[PDB]
Amino acid sequence: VRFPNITNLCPFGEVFNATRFASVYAWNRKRISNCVADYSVLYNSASFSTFKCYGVSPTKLNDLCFTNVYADSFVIRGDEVRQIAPGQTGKIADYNYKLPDDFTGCVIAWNSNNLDSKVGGNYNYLYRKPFERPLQSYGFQPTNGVGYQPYRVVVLSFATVCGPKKSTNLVKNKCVNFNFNGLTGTGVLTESNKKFLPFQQFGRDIADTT
Amino acid sequence: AYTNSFTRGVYYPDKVFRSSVLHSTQDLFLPFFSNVTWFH
C-alpha cells in the first residue's frame, strides 16, 4: 500500500497545547482545513481525562474525511464538563456553549489545575441556539477539589480534512496485491524503462489497461 | 476585436501516461479554429 508522504498535517498542536484558552461564554473557534488530520495522537494520548465522539466512532477518525472541521476551545469547571454533549441542559449547555442534538464531532477534555488555576483565584474565565456565541467568574484555585478544577475543553465539530494513510514497504519482482493512490490490482512490480511526465501518475496500455 | 484560435486550446485531460497511441476523449476543450476575443 503506497500513498504520498504524510506531510501537511492540521495544527492540533495550536489547539490542544495552546498557551491560553478562552472562557466558555466567548470561546475561540479555529478552523481546521486543507490537511491530513491525525487523530491517533488525541485518541491514544493519556494526557486527556476524557475522549468521546457522538456522531462517529473515535477509532475511525483516521479513515473518515470531513468537509470542514472546527475547534471550539474553552475553559470550564470540572463538574460542568458533562454538559459538553448533545442533548444536554445546564448553565453551559443552555447559556454559553450549546451543541446540536444531531451533533457530529468529538469532545476532548483535560484538567488544567497546574496551568490556569491560581492561588488567589483565576477569575478571568466567565460564564452566563447551537454554537451561538449577566456573567459570573469561576474561582479557579489549585487547592480546590477535582470538580472545581478548570478543564480545557476542545470540541471538534465535523472534503478538505481527511485522515492519514499509512504506507507499507514496496517489494519488487514478486506477485503482490497492490494499492497505489486511487487504484488497486494484482501483479508483479518491476523497474520500468518508461518516461512519465512530471504530472502523470499512471500509465495505460492500448486497450484501457494499467 | 477577434482572432483565430487555430489548433491551440488542448491540454492533458488527465494524469495518465500514454505512448505511441491515438486516444479518443471528451472533455471541455477550445474548439479548433473558433473565435477568441482579443484584448489590448
Add this chain to the structure above:
Amino acid sequence: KYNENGTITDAVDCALDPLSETKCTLKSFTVEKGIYQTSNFRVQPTESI
C-alpha cells in the same frame, strides 16, 4: 496523438469538418482512400407546438 515520451504532439477536433469526423471514426490521423460512414444526419425541429 501521444508520442513515445507521453506527450501530445497533435490532435483532431472531431466536429470541425467531415474529414476530421472520418479521422476520429477511424481513429487515425491519416486515412486511406475510400468511402466511410461517420455520422447521422437529422433534420432538427424549428418550432414547438
